[PDB]
Each structure stands twice: as C-alpha cells, then as structure tokens.
Amino acid sequence: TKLYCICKTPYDESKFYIGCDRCQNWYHGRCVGILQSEAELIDEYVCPQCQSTEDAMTVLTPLTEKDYEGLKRVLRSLQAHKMAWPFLEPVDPNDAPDYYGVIKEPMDLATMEERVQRRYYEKLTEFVADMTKIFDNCRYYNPSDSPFYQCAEVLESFFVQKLKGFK
C-alpha cells in the first residue's frame, strides 16, 4: 500500500527487490545496481545512500579499542617506511633555525605515537589531520623537486592506501 525505492513506486511482485538493513526501506535491484545472483552472495544489504553515509562517517565515529590498536599498527608500518626517514622525529631545534621560526604547529610520527598512546585522538579525522599536518608542513617548507617534499608525497600515498578499509 506504500511507496518504495529511490524511484518512489508501489510494490510490483514481478520485480526483484532487496531490503536495506540500515534504513529498512525496500529497493528495486535494477535501481541500485544489484541483481539476484549477486544478492545471494551477501548477508546484510546496505543501500547506496546508507552506504555513502557509512563511508562518510567512518572518519567521525568514536575511536574504539581495536581502532586505537589499529592506529598503532599503522604508525608502525609508516615508521618502517624508507621514505619515512624525515618524519620519524621532531626537527632538532638547534639544527634547523627557521624551521620553528616559521612552523608553529609541527608534527612527526613520534609525537603522533604519543598522542595515540594517551588517546589524544577520539576520531579518525583527528589522526588523519595530524598525519596530513606532517606532509603539508613538509611541502610548505621544502621545494617540490627536493627529496624532503617527494618523500612527503611517497609516504602520503602509502598512508592513503594503508588507511583503506580501516574501520
């Protein structure tokens, strides 16, 4: 007696429907890009909009126990990376003057490890913000053809892949 799907249409017993387990609405398989045989291979179904919302909220949901452990393993893999040599530790002040003269929010993997250890981060977005802060500081301070900058590029690319499927 009701209207279903993104296409707002009443039930048609001759059409293949699948139910979203998040929103409990029903969708034509043809409208959300899943056929019956593909549907047979999955336990829960999640509709495209609901799925978008889940993808978007991964960076915003509270960090759990396992998430924190995961962040520790991520930093470890980053610390072991060959192009991670410039980011392992804070810049030695009595070594690079103008570094702290122009960078007022430095970040480094050791400091990030400390922040993870004491649960300074509560959302994945905060952790990602600090990692990005490392690479952007670097790219702001160094020329784009320099090894420092390019190292920032390489490790950021590695990082983005390592983060996939995290939550």
């Binding site: 059409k15 293949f16 429907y17 699948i18 139910g19 029903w26």
Partner: peptide, 6 residues
C-alpha cells in the same frame, strides 16, 4: 540478504 523475488 533480504529480498523479494517473483
């Protein structure tokens, strides 16, 4: 999954 077929 939860479906309705013909």
């Amino acid at each position: 999954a939860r479906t309705k077929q013909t």
